[PDB]
Every structure is written in structure tokens, then in C-alpha cells.
């Protein structure tokens, strides 16, 4: 059954919610981004209504087959009718598609989604600033103040001069790119850049990639495994076994691999600064692990609640526990009492 965090109240709509069959009520059925633990249920046999961005429709019709008459996609930042109920989607800083959704209840109330976000002060200039929000339903995955990592532009400031150090010093090095996912895009996109190489992947992968409206992307993106020097590769093959398999494969033309794994946070980030990342290597295998996050750190987080002052904060991360339910009501209270809201 649906959960309550994932219903609008006074609407006949939810949120991320297809993997409880046909839910009471229901009349539309939003879509925030294409990640399996959101999509989950959707397929060719779903006959209700999906409203998304453009790239979440792509993604829907080209990879999980969904009909088009049932794909309703949204211009963003653009005040749309959705069965008599204003609606504005907003970019959430996420992977590609992803977005917020605003909604302005019949009775005057306004409710933000926030769906999977990362936080940014660019926010504070998007149609949000033009009114009150009453509800705020708010992506808590690091909603902890030991949740601290770099910029996005730290990151990969990072991974671009060690690839680019690494393949000058050996130009029979090899880099790999761990993905599971969209999101992180540019990690491998940056690393190709600097080396004047395309990235090399899966046939299933480049059709992903090919749904995003990314430019330039046929620039970028190839499934010649041949004739590129960044290749990508599931997750779960990055490690040193994997990785070894992977370097017999390539019948002598490589012989090191350089192999990153962006991760969201780990607990090396409470003691180490980016500057100070070092590998994991066995033999002529090294693997870095970048704390690449599409997520709000914790003073993200709380400068963007600070600033939009909602009456009331329902979390959807986080909330199978006890513990972790009061530990975030007790950070809404401090918040909300430093800034006077
Ligand atoms: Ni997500």
C-alpha cells in the first residue's frame, strides 16, 4: 500500500509511487526521475497517466517501453493545468530529467515536491521566490551534520588532472568509469575531454545516454570499445578482479588500469580533504573513490530550508526508523528557531 509521503493531499495525484498497483483515488501520476527506486512498476502494460519532464519521457518510452498516448511530458519552469490543479516542474540538480514539483491547491495552499535534489542557492532564483510555500516534502538522504563533501567542480577538478597526470606519464594506461545509474555524467565525460578520446561503453548504455538531450553527445559517446582510452563499465565490475578481466580483453593494448568509482558520501570525507584522495592499488591496477554527490550536503540542506521558511517539512528519506525520524525533527526545530520562521 501507497504511503502517506507520497500522496498529495486535495489532489487526486502521487509522487514516485508505481510499485503499489492501482492506488486508490489516484487520477495522475507523477514521475520526479528515472532511478529504479522511483520508476519501479512502470512498463508497456501501464494505461494511466505519467506526467515527467522531456527526458524522463524519453527514458520511459525508449527503455522501459511505456506508451506514448500515456506519456504526458512538461516544459520546465512553465505554469501547466494538470487536472485543474496549477503545476510548475523545476530543475532539481539531480541526474538528467530530474525535477521539483510545485503544486497551488484549489484552496490556496502551495506544496513543493522536492523529489532527489542537490540543493544550490541558484533556487533562490527560480519561480520559488515569487511565493509562500506552505508543505514542504524534502529529499533527507543526508540530512546529518557528519554529511559534509566538495563541489561538484572540486570533484571533478580532481579526477580531470589525475586521469590527464596518469596517461601522460603512461600513455598505455587505460581510465574506467564505474556507473549503475544515470547521474554523474560528468565524470566521464570530463575525463574524455581532457584526453581527446571518446568514452567507450555498452550498447544498452549509449541508448541511455542518446535519451538525455545532452549536446554534443554524439561528440562524446561511442560503442567503438577500440577506439576509446576512458571505457565504462557496471559498478560491480570495479573492483580488482573485475578490472584484471577487463584488461585481458583488451588483447595488450593497455597495460594499467586508472579506475574511478564515484560514491555518494563515505566516511573518509570527515577526516580528508579532495586535495588528499588517495587510491586503492594492487599491482598495475589503481581505483579512486570520488565522493561525487546529486544529493544535498547537510549545510546545503539547511540553508535552502532556512531560506524558504515552510510551515510544515515531511521527510521522505530516511523514515523506517525511530531513531532517524527524531534526529531529523530535532534539525527542522533548530533550523527553524535560529532563523525565526
Ligand atoms: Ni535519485
Not at 532511478?35 to 506526467?51: I, N, R
Not at 541558484?122 to 557528519?146: F, G, I, N, W
Request: hydrophobic letters at 35%; glycine letters at 6%; aromatic letters at 12%.
Amino acid at each position: 500500500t501507497c504511503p502517506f509521503y507520497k500522496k498529495i493531499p486535495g489532489t487526486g495525484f502521487t509522487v514516485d509511487a508505481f510499485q503499489y498497483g492501482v492506488v486508490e483515488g489516484c487520477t495522475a501520476y507523477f514521475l520526479t526521475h528515472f532511478h529504479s527506486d522511483h520508476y519501479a512498476g512502470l512498463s508497456k502494460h501501464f494505461t494511466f497517466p505519467v506526467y515527467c519532464s522531456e527526458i524522463t519521457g524519453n527514458l520511459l518510452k525508449n527503455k522501459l517501453h511505456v506508451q506514448e498516448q500515456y506519456i504526458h511530458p512538461l516544459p520546465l519552469d512553465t505554469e501547466c493545468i494538470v487536472n485543474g490543479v496549477k503545476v510548475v516542474l523545476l530543475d532539481a540538480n539531480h541526474c538528467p530529467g530530474a525535477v521539483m514539483i510545485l503544486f497551488y491547491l484549489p484552496n490556496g495552499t502551495v506544496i513543493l515536491h522536492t523529489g532527489d535534489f542537490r540543493a544550490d542557492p541558484s533556487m533562490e532564483r527560480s519561480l520559488l521566490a515569487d511565493q509562500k510555500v506552505h508543505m514542504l516534502y524534502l529529499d533527507t538522504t543526508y540530512c546529518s551534520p557528519e554529511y559534509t563533501f566538495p563541489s561538484q567542480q572540486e570533484v571533478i577538478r580532481f579526477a580531470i588532472n589525475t586521469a590527464f597526470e596518469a596517461v601522460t606519464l603512461n600513455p598505455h594506461a587505460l581510465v574506467v568509469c564505474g556507473t549503475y545509474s544515470i547521474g554523474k555524467e560528468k565524470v566521464f565525460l570530463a575525463i574524455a575531454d581532457v584526453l581527446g578520446s571518446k568514452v567507450g561503453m555498452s550498447q544498452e548504455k549509449y541508448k541511455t545516454l542518446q535519451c538525455l538531450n545532452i549536446p554534443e553527445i554524439n561528440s562524446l559517446i561511442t560503442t567503438d570499445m577500440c577506439s576509446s582510452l576512458v571505457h565504462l563499465l557496471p559498478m560491480m565490475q570495479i573492483n580488482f578482479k573485475g578490472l584484471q578481466s577487463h584488461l585481458k580483453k583488451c588483447g595488450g593494448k593497455y597495460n594499467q588500469i586508472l579506475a574511478f568509482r564515484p560514491t555518494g558520501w563515505t566516511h573518509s570525507n570527515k577526516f580528508t580533504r579532495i586535495a588528499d584522495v588517495i587510491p586503492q592499488t594492487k599491482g598495475n591496477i589503481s581505483i579512486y573513490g570520488i565522493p561525487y554527490s546529486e544529493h544535498s550536503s547537510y549545510l546545503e540542506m539547511k540553508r535552502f530550508v532556512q531560506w524558504l521558511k515552510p510551515q510544515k517539512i515531511i521527510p521522505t528519506v530516511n523514515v523506517g526508523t525511530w531513531k532517524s525520524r527524531s534526529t531529523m525533527e530535532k534539525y527542522f526545530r533548530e533550523w527553524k528557531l535560529e532563523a525565526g520562521y
